[PDB]
RNA sequence: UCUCUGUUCACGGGAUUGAUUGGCAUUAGCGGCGAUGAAGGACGUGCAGGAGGACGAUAUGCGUUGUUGUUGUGACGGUGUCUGAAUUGUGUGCGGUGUGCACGGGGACCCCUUGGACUUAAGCAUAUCAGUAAAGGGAGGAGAAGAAACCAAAUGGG
RNA sequence: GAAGUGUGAAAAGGAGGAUGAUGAGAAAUGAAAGUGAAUGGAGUGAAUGGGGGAUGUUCCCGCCCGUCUUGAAACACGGACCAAGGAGACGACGGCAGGAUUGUUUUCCGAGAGGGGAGGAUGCUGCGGUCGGACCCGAAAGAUGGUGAGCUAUGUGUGU
RNA sequence: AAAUGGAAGGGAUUGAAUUGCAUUCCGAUGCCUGCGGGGGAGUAUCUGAGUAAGGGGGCGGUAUCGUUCUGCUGAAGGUCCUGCGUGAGCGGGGGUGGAGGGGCGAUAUGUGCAGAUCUUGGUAGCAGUAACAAGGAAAUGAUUUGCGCUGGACGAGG
RNA sequence: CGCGGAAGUGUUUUGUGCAAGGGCCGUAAGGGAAGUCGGCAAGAUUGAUGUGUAACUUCGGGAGAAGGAUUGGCUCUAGC
RNA sequence: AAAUGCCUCGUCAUGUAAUUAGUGACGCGCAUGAAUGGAGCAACGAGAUUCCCACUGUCCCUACGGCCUGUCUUGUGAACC
RNA sequence: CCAACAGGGAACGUGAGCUGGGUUUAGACCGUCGUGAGACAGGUUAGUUUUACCCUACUGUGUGGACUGUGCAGCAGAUC
């Protein structure tokens, strides 16, 4: 099927999981996964369960035209930094305040399924699921699925789905 | 109201299955098939160039004419029993 | 983080290269349907079956003969529901109440009837396209034609 | 009145994931448009280009192509993006040019009555001319032969 | 004396916007001078813009006949890097791929694309936007309670 | 018929609580068509029973002309 | 001076504070007129016009309130250009 | 009535702002003209007003304390 784009060095410490042609919106699922890397595997499962209860939000950064504003999104702001010696010259970099977020909740169930498979694959190799770190997440586009809808004056237009593929790799950083 | 609303009145059927050709084109008030022309003894002249190759010799089974063609390659010898009488 | 732009890996789509039990052309033979019920149509047939193909109540096949031991097959003969010219009819010959023949299918090429307009004339009416297309009737492996009430003006041909 | 051909020499085998097995090979090849992940550089200037220099920029020059037109950057028309397909070829008859083979070539004037000696032929390639669907795509119409009163209009039989 | 705030090109300038001068200087792809390339010319040389249009010399696709080579010790195609040519284009190297591919002379052509509101197929931005759905409840729900108004038969059509 | 009820039949159980601007409606001091091409739109009259009814007129009509009055609940009387 | 009159907002009277409107009267009428039918309105008209009473958010000049949308969430998820 | 009731420009400012009275294809009447089909800048009556969710402009809003200085931009009272 679909191949991994990550090269796993030291394959005794890694774990993998996949889903091909998942029946979930590609754009919403790609936003929900954009803060998962470098988290602990058990802290990313609790973070996605608070998104379903609506106590933490998902930051909307790329596919976000006309999204709602909320106070929970200010936790992902980028601070003002100093960039010394671009090419020998020091410069200054303003920050960004986030302000846009949402609570998808069907993308969050799909990502919890993939994270549970990685947790049961670590048991067979006998390593501690409290020591896993997420080192790789990728959400891609899958082929379209066709449908239809009725418009005024006896017309028909397309009415389609946009699914996706999901991969993940986890590692022990000893 | 000559559009959508006029379509809800179209529940009468004028035709039935023709007993010569098998299409839904035997008009009952006219007593006439619009495809093959039944009950005229001859079949109707086709209405288009393609219509000639949809129903002709060879588009069905040819149950007898195939047999006769195998018999004319061997001089039409018949049943070997009856050959004494002939 | 976002926007633009290098690099590497993974997608998305089906171009390109190479194949082909298919198509297309020219040439040589043949041109083999029907009241002894055709072509076409409807419905059926396998122990376990829908499509297609095959087959007809002798139904997913029977007999004879060749080759086989196989899911077996070739060449020839028999059977063929209900329909359809579809006729237990209509017309007509020979007889004197018996017994024949015609009808439908196909029509590229052939014989007879009927018969356009687009188009060209830088316009358009005679003219042209053209006695051609379309329509109808009648035949065959071809058909039609054919043995001078001819051609001519030589030392005549046939 | 369509669209749709390909696992392999062998099924030796797969089809949620992971761990694996078989095979020469995971399995026809797999471009562009467009996208995801990681990592390097730059930016708050529409972008892109040429000269001259350089591991991005700093100086100079530079309005969007095709087309009709006296005249287009145009408040003239076509063009969101990529692949593949897509338009002066063929026949007949004549002329000329270049080339090949051979050369012992010629029925004249005039309406007629009458009068009376003066190098071509057969192929091959190209260009100009005419008729052919005639460089490619495009009318409003005309004619021949057939289909319809299940919508709707009028008459008539029989019901509500 | 005119209708958005505005123009000796601008900031400015009392001569840096007037007049008269030249003994200095700057400034083209034009001129002179040394090399290189093309085309003419009677061979010591002379001469290069160009739409419509016409002529000469070259590059490339697919095949035929005719000659001459290469591939499982890894061909074509495809991708990245690199050499040669004024150019059309032609070579080599490393991955991928798993079966064929070329040079030279004459000959046959359905012989080269950015456009035609071109044809067919695939794909972006717009945009997770417009539009639509989320029907009163009781941890449970064959029990309790709240709301809406068509309900039951024959024909056509299925 | 309208305005309300039966019978039979249909129906769910973790979206928000309501800015501007829309669609369909309600109430308004004092004035009373000054609005507008134009009383468009809205407001107004409305059932029944006594009373009272003009010009004109094809003598049939006009006519419910116009204009004025009465109306609930309770307890009784009179007629057939 | 009419759904027929160019000149033309004809001239006189009447309705208003004010009348290119309406009605009455006048007539050399660009170009009225007799089944091309002329004159004429009882009854009838979702026909075209002008005025009176009544009534009012039409307006002076706007205010406040209701329900459904919009604003905010989850799911499904186009098009024009 | 008034202090006074000046004159003009902005795609003869302004229809994805409205309205649709003029103009206003297809129905109809009258007058004049034409043998006729029909004609008239002659009169009369009846006659569909589509789509923003994109870029910019403009209005607010967001872009991370407390007390203040000083530059820039806006600018209001008029008449009896
Ligand atoms: Zn038939």
Short mmCIF file of C-alpha atoms (C1' of nucleotides) in Angstrom, two decimals, chain E residues 134-138 144-147, chain F residues 11-13:
data_model
loop_
_atom_site.label_atom_id
_atom_site.label_comp_id
_atom_site.label_asym_id
_atom_site.label_seq_id
_atom_site.Cartn_x
_atom_site.Cartn_y
_atom_site.Cartn_z
"C1'" A E 134 -29.17 19.15 14.15
"C1'" G E 135 -37.66 17.13 15.67
"C1'" G E 136 -39.86 18.11 23.58
"C1'" A E 137 -37.81 15.38 27.54
"C1'" A E 138 -36.92 11.39 31.64
"C1'" U E 144 -43.91 7.50 32.12
"C1'" U E 145 -45.07 12.20 30.01
"C1'" G E 146 -45.04 16.72 25.76
"C1'" C E 147 -46.44 18.21 20.62
"C1'" U F 11 -42.44 11.89 16.14
"C1'" U F 12 -37.14 12.88 19.36
"C1'" U F 13 -34.10 12.89 23.95
#
